[PDB]
Design a protein around this nucleic acid. Structure first.
Ligand SMILES: O=P(O)(O)O[C@H]1[C@@H](OP(=O)(O)O)[C@@H](OP(=O)(O)O)[C@@H](OP(=O)(O)O)[C@@H](OP(=O)(O)O)[C@H]1OP(=O)(O)O
Ligand SMILES: [Mg+2]
Ligand SMILES: [Mg+2]
Ligand SMILES: [Mg+2]
Ligand SMILES: [Mg+2]
Ligand SMILES: [Mg+2]
Lengths: 290, 49, 222, 299, 107, 34
RNA sequence: GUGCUCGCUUCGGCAGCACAUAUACUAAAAUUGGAACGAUACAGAGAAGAUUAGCAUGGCCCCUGCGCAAGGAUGACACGCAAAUUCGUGAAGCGUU
RNA sequence: CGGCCUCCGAACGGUAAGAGCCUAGCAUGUAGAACUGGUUACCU
């Protein structure tokens, strides 16, 4: 059995009011992954929002570093597969019954020897947040998660409970959509979760700077410079990132053309700066010159 | 700021979960170094004995 | 309802408990079900106590429906309490009951042989049911903690499961010899075959134990 | 040591020393008054009883011989520290009497601030009222002037008021606090008076025969208010050297009269600190907080 | 492990619930001021009125019935008096109905 | 993972510890003795 | 909604005061998955020539029992190289420095 | 003036043990559900 002090949850899922009232139940339910009994905490998210419940053990949380009910990552907040890929992690948690119960037992025994402060294992050795992860991250609280379900009655017409229909009396979503059927077990293990694939395709279609053909094209064109930048400022953007060989600050077009001394240095600089080199608030467009 | 209140237990409620699960025992602790005194020799005759 | 929920939760569909709390099979059961469907003294003691109370409350329902009479109710209750032996069959499961049973006989011989001291006859109409009632109430005072323990154990075992991991069963009377030999040959294996060795390679302790058993048979054969 | 005291069931609102520096009195929501010995293990000997409402302010006499204690249940009470027993139940207050002050070194006389709209003057012996200056509204703290001839009070309208006991008119009204004043305490100078107010500012004033006509002297930053609006109280040190304040921030604020610097914002508490008590002899500090216990800090 | 007072927490929570703004609870080691968090402009325009504090509101209360004479056999609505501006049936209509049939077939 | 099973032999019994009295042999006397 | 304002003030309303202060695993569902020792059929019982009593040990095997008692075929299961760190003589023949 | 009047009934140990097989039940009643479209110029 687990025993906790509070949930460990996403701010989205925790609610809007600063003042929340929440109930605990000791040994209340069984972790859908750890398979063992847990303490279950239940809170009312907001006005006219479903009561939510912590749905995974505190150890099953600390292991993969997620929110015990929202299930999304704690820092960035993407599906577990996406975060794993962006951290280039390879999580080896067993699948079959006996092996998984055994692994859970020993992982719990070893997490007993912790400080309760940070995830155990590679989730400390993989906290180097890649710009892909930061780029996919949610920005404001998608609080549409906490509205109630779809009223089978009010979908057939029957929700004769007036306005109190226990579920959102709107149109039912077409079951063909990939974003419909995502079993909890897979969403925790990260094996074929449709939201992960859609978000990954979105991250693949997202703009990133393109590389040139020729090795000798070592002039990099930064578009959208503005006349509040200095040649020394463009340097400080591309100075310690390697070596720069020359800098042409074109004031007749508000752009720049940086000749470097190391191809990998300039490549890392410009790709890492792609539309996001925000110096004095200017959206520069890093590309390889002609 | 959150208000913890513990939920009532129903007096007439049987246990909820299956306790008896069997698994092999975990790995022990990191083996300690064997601080012996150096071994001596057994002649062939002793092993005959 | 509780006893039927128990029966049907164990998945014993071939049995049913009828309305006077008799348990009856509705098939002929093979061995596997004659075994799977045996019940204990907790189940049966609860069954028989409920049967006594149903007898009592149903005598009262007959009174209230208009079927009997005040006098017939009183004497029928006296009957019930005097003859728990021949109406329930409780003694089968907690045989200490005969304390109570013999007591409710002794009382009856008193009361009767003082009830019918004159023209009053040896007939049925004697219901002065205070005494036997008292007796079975004290019995229940005693039995409720016992049965609450036994039923708590049954329900736990039915909902958690039986613990076959660290049972650690005592050494009783059928395991005295087998245990003596367990511990004797554990001792022998500790003793020299690991603490006076220097038959380094493989100290053959599995063969010194063979010598031990044969020395014993040779002792016995002189 | 830290010496945290416990044994109170609800918030403690008021804690103060024997003017000997011998015994400790604390009180709050639990409707009774606990006493302790300041030295040794800081141990509890006595408990005074009777007050039906919350004990909102306890106040000693200047020898330590009888105890005054303002209760929520429309009443003040004077008791015998000799016994702990009631001598007088000052009734007649038409509402919540929050603040009480016994005249020091004058005839035995009491000023009580209440939530009725009046300040009340009472003599202990007569079982009757002396004077009462109904300004308009609730008065939240009240203290005499060392002549026992002016009476100072602070309420909701932010203008600290002082009445002359003989002409019975608003003698001295002072202004400059942005929100409700919650605490007054006149230093043992008989001159300098300290004012806490939940607008987050503390002020110092001086009642004299002649003052600059605008006697807002020293100003310190740091105190807090929040949705609690608990009553916040201040004190001078025995020497007029350090001002101690509490706040709803769990931080004991210790400042100095001289440089107005932040000598301390001490953590250690769990709930709002409602009252800090200075030892009349020692550098000993006692914190009464809404976390249902007290602290005994040594500086 | 805080310990706070009880009327006040529920006061602030109900405030934030029914009015949409609340005295923010951050007890920061940097001294912040009383700031109404949430619907700040609503707190400004409504004068900070709490759901518990009485305040002037000309808001049109929904029309209800009132049949409180308990001698009429099918008369007494009493405390169970329905709202008069309420609907008499709850259902989805022709387009959403056929669409939901199509979805239940698609599933 | 605590069971609610129970045993006839785990009922409370002998719930007070006898201590060795003043004359029997208390650790004070044996501390003294020669 | 209740009462009182020496409220307008008629006995229509309005107002003010007081009193009263936050239910709920929201579902009649809709889901989703596994067992019945039931058929079905196969299957088919330790030791040693034969016939048979049992008590144990081991553990990712259970079942009946309140059970730390007892029972379940001695409850079942438990055997083809159950080979592990590691060699050297004696002679001969052939080719080599 | 004598009196002396036990007990008492049920279970197991006997009628195999097994793999497949397939369908009720019986359990679940959840968690989650999505976001756009920047480009070249001077001296031989
Ligand atoms: O059946 P039992 O438990 O033994 O009780 C009966 C009975 O009592 P109920 O009236 O409650 O049935 C008889 O009572 P009567 O015939 O007197 O009315 C009778 O007792 P009597 O001996 O006095 O007749 C008889 O006894 P027996 O078979 O010896 O006649 C016997 O009581 P016992 O316990 O006396 O046998
Ligand atoms: Mg044989
Ligand atoms: Mg056995
Ligand atoms: Mg046999
Ligand atoms: Mg066996
Ligand atoms: Mg047998």
């Amino acid at each position: 059995w687990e025993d906790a002090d509070f949930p460990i949850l996403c701010q989205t899922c925790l609610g809007e009011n600063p003042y929340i009232r929440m109930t605990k139940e000791k040994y209340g339910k069984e972790c859908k992954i750890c398979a063992r009994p847990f303490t279950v905490f239940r809170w009312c998210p907001g006005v006219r929002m479903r009561f939510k419940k912590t749905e995974v053990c505190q150890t099953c949380s600390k292991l993969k570093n997620v929110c015990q009910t929202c299930l999304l990552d704690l820092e960035y907040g993407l599906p577990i597969q996406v975060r794993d890929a962006g951290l280039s992690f390879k999580d080896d948690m067993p699948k079959s019954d006996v092996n998984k119960e055994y692994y859970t037992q020993n992982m719990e025994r070893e997490i007993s020897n912790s400080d309760g402060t940070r995830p155990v294992g590679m989730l400390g050795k993989a906290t180097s947040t890649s710009d892909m992860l930061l780029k996919l991250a949610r920005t404001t609280p998608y609080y549409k998660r906490n509205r109630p379900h779809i009223c089978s009655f009010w979908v057939k017409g029957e929700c004769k409970r007036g306005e109190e229909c226990p579920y959102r009396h709107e149109k039912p979503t077409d079951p063909d959509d990939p974003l419909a059927d995502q079993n909890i077990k897979d969403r925790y293990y990260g094996i074929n979760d449709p939201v992960a694939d859609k978000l990954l395709k979105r991250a693949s279609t997202m703009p990133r700077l393109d590389p040139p053909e020729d090795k000798t094209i070592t002039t990099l064109y930064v578009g959208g410079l503005g006349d509040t930048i200095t040649e020394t400022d463009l340097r400080n953007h591309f100075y310690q990132f390697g070596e720069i060989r020359t800098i042409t600050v074109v004031q007749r077009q508000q752009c720049a053309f940086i000749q470097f001394a190391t191809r990998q240095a300039a490549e890392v600089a410009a790709e890492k700066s792609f539309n996001k080199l925000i110096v004095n608030g200017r959206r520069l467009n890093v590309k390889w010159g002609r | 700021v959150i208000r913890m209140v513990e939920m009532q237990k129903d007096p007439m409620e049987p246990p909820r979960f299956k306790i008896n699960k069997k698994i092999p025992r975990g790995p022990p602790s990191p083996p300690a170094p064997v601080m012996h005194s150096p071994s001596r020799k057994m002649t062939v005759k002793e092993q005959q004995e | 309802n509780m006893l039927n929920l128990l029966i049907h939760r164990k998945n014993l569909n071939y049995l049913h408990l009828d309305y006077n709390f008799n348990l009856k099979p509705v098939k002929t059961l093979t061995t596997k079900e004659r075994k799977k469907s045996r019940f204990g003294n907790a189940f049966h003691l609860c069954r028989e106590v409920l049967r006594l109370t149903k007898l009592v409350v149903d005598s009262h329902v007959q009174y209230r429906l208009g079927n009997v009479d005040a006098f017939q109710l009183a004497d029928g209750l006296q009957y019930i309490f005097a003859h728990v032996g021949q109406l329930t069959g409780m003694y089968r499961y907690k045989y200490k009951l005969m304390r109570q049973i013999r007591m409710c006989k002794d009382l009856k011989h008193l009361i009767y042989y003082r009830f019918n001291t004159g023209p009053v006859g040896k007939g049925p109409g004697c219901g002065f049911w205070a005494a036997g009632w008292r007796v079975w109430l004290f019995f229940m005072r005693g039995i409720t903690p016992l049965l609450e323990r036994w039923l708590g154990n049954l329900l736990a075992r039915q909902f958690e499961g039986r613990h076959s991991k660290g049972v650690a069963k005592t050494v009783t009377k059928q395991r005295v010899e087998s245990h003596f030999d367990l511990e004797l040959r554990a001792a022998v294996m500790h003793d020299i075959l690991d603490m006076m060795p220097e038959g380094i390679k493989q100290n053959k302790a599995r063969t010194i134990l063979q010598h031990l058993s044969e020395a014993w048979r040779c002792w016995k054969a002189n | 040591p830290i010496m945290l005291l416990s044994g109170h069931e609800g918030e403690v609102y008021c804690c103060k020393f024997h003017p000997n520096g011998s015994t400790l009195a604390s009180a709050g929501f639990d409707r009774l008054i606990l006493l302790w010995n300041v030295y040794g293990d800081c141990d509890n000997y006595a408990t005074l009883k009777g007050h039906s409402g919350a004990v909102m302010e306890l106040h000693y006499n200047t020898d330590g011989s009888m105890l005054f204690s303002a209760s929520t249940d429309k009443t003040v009470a004077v008791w015998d520290s000799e016994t702990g027993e009631r001598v007088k139940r000052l009734k007649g207050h038409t509402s919540f009497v929050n603040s009480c002050y016994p005249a020091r070194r004058g005839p035995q006389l009491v000023c009580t601030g209440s939530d009725d709209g009046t300040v009340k003057l009472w003599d202990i012996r007569k079982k009757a009222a002396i004077q009462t200056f109904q300004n308009t509204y609730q008065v939240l703290a009240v203290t005499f002037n060392d002549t026992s001839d002016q009476i100072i009070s602070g309420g909701i309208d932010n203008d600290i008021k002082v009445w002359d006991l003989r002409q019975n008119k608003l003698t001295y009204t002072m202004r400059g606090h942005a929100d409700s004043v919650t605490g007054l305490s006149l230093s043992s100078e008989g001159s300098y008076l300290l004012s806490n107010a939940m607008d987050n500012t503390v002020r110092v004033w001086d009642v004299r025969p002649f003052a600059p006509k605008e006697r807002c002297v020293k100003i310190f930053q740091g105190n807090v208010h929040n949705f609690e609006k608990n009553l916040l109280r201040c004190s001078w040190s025995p020497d007029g050297s350090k001002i101690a304040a509490g706040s709803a921030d769990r931080f004991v604020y210790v400042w100095d009269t001289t440089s107005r610097r932040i000598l301390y914002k001490l953590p250690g508490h769990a709930g709002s600190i409602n009252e800090v008590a200075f030892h009349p002899d020692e550098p000993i500090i006692i914190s009464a907080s809404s976390d249902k216990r007290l602290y005994m800090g040594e500086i | 492990p805080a310990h706070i007072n009880d009327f006040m927490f529920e006061q602030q929570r109900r405030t934030f619930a029914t009015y949409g703004y609340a005295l923010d609870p951050s007890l920061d080691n940097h001294q912040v001021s009383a700031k109404y968090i949430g619907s700040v402009e609503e707190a400004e325009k409504n004068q900070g009125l709490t759901v518990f504090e009485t305040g002037q509101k000309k808001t049109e209360k929904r029309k209800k019935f009132k049949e409180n004479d308990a001698s009429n056999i099918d008369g007494f609505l009493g405390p169970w008096a329905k709202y008069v501006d309420e609907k008499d049936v709850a259902k989805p209509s022709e387009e959403e109905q056929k669409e939901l049939d199509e979805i239940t077939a698609k599933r | 993972q605590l069971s609610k099973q129970y045993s006839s032999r785990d009922l409370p019994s002998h719930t007070k510890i006898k201590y060795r009295q003043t004359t029997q042999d208390a650790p004070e006397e044996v501390r003294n003795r020669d």
